[PDB]
């Protein structure tokens, strides 16, 4: 004869929302890898990054004499026409974060004193990129070191 419960939250989050979210979520994350970011979400993160990067640059000594600054796609795009170009990303906001290097490249080319094949072999360019990331760690100066 007796009736124990109605459990309105369960009825309202199963009926109105076609799922059962009120469950321990450990079973999902351990068993299944986290889902990738949606296309819409990607646009939002990029907008935030550009503003943050600009601040880091300005309240610090920087050189516009031989450099080029790019705020596009949250990538630094700091390059010199003569010898090289670099593109960066900083995950951190106000808190100081070691400068992170996405890619380092060299712009000098001569086919003939090589031979049909570029001046530096990708092993060495992988090697150079890590060395830079090393000096930056101290991070005394953002763009002068």
């Amino acid at each position: 004869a007796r009736l124990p419960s109605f459990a309105i939250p369960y009825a309202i989050d199963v009926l109105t929302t076609g799922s059962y979210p009120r469950l321990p979520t450990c079973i999902r994350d351990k068993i299944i890898p986290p889902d990738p970011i949606t296309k819409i979400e990607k646009q939002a993160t990029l907008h935030q990054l550009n503003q943050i990067l600009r601040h880091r640059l300005v309240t610090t000594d920087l050189p516009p004499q031989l450099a080029n600054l790019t705020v596009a796609n949250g990538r630094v795009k700091f390059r010199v026409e003569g010898e090289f170009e670099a593109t960066l990303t900083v995950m951190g906001d106000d808190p100081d974060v070691p400068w992170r290097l996405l890619k380092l490249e060299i712009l000098v080319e001569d086919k003939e004193t090589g031979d049909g094949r570029a001046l530096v072999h990708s092993m060495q360019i992988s090697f150079i990129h890590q060395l830079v990331q090393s000096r930056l760690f101290a991070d005394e100066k953002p763009l002068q070191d």
Binding site: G114, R117, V120, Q124, I128, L131, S134, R135, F137
Partner: peptide, 25 residues
């Protein structure tokens, strides 16, 4: 069920770079 034999120079520059710019970690 390749190398174009120019690493006998670029290597030297890297050494001159490493000898002049030690890692800071």
């Amino acid at each position: 069920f390749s190398s174009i034999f120019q690493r006998q120079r670029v290597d030297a520059l890297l050494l001159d770079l490493r000898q002049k710019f030690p890692p800071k970690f």
